């Protein structure tokens, strides 16, 4: 029961933990796409009004 | 009658005693199956959500 308690201290919901690993990767890649596009916009600003 | 008394001190119900030898072996093997399966479950947890 002690190792069960300590387990609860150090439990992982590997389902959740992997799901948020996944999700945080999705959000990373998403934010990356947003930075690419953030670079794409002002390129257009200048080149369409240079 | 003395050896009968002392016999009662050291009697065995070999029927019961063998029956519980048997039973405790059954319960051993059962618990073993439960440990195998206890190993089988988290294998599935990770591999189905790795």
The per-residue DSSP string of chain B comes to -HHHHHHHHH---HHHHHHHHHHHHHHHHHHHHHHHHHHHHHHHHHHH--
Q: Is B8 touching A (CB cutoff 8 A)?
A: no
Residue tagged 């599935």 (tokens): B44
Angle of the A14-48 helix axis to the B14-48 helix axis, nearest 10: 0
- State the resolution, in angstroms: 6.7
CA distance linking residue A34 with residue A32, whole number of Å: 5
Give CA–CA dist A18/B48, Å, rounded.
Answer: 11
**A18 interface with B at CB cutoff 8 Å:** yes
How many Å separate Cα A4 from the centre of its chain? 32
Task: Name every residue whose Cβ is closer than 8 Å to that of residue B46 and which is 6 or more positions away in sequence.
Answer: A14
Residues 21-50 of chain B whose Cβ lies under 8 A from any Cβ of chain A: 45-46, 49-50
Dihedral in degrees, nearest 10, Cα atoms B27, B32, B35, B41: -100
Mutate one of A14, A19, A20, A23 to test the B interface: name it (highest B CB count within 10 A). A14
Please, which residues have CB within 8 angstroms of residue A14's CB and are 6 or more apart in sequence? B45, B46, B49, B50
Q: Which residues of chain A have a CB within 8 Å of the CB of B49?
A: 14-15, 18-19
List alpha helices for chain A, DSSP H.
2-10, 14-48
């Amino acid at each position: 029961n002690l190792t069960a308690a300590e387990s609860r201290i150090r439990d992982v919901d590997m389902a959740k933990e992997m799901s948020e690993f996944t999700k945080n990767n999705i959000l990373s890649q998403a934010s990356q796409a947003m930075l690419a596009q953030a670079n794409q916009q002002p390129q257009n600003v200048l080149q369409l009004l240079r």
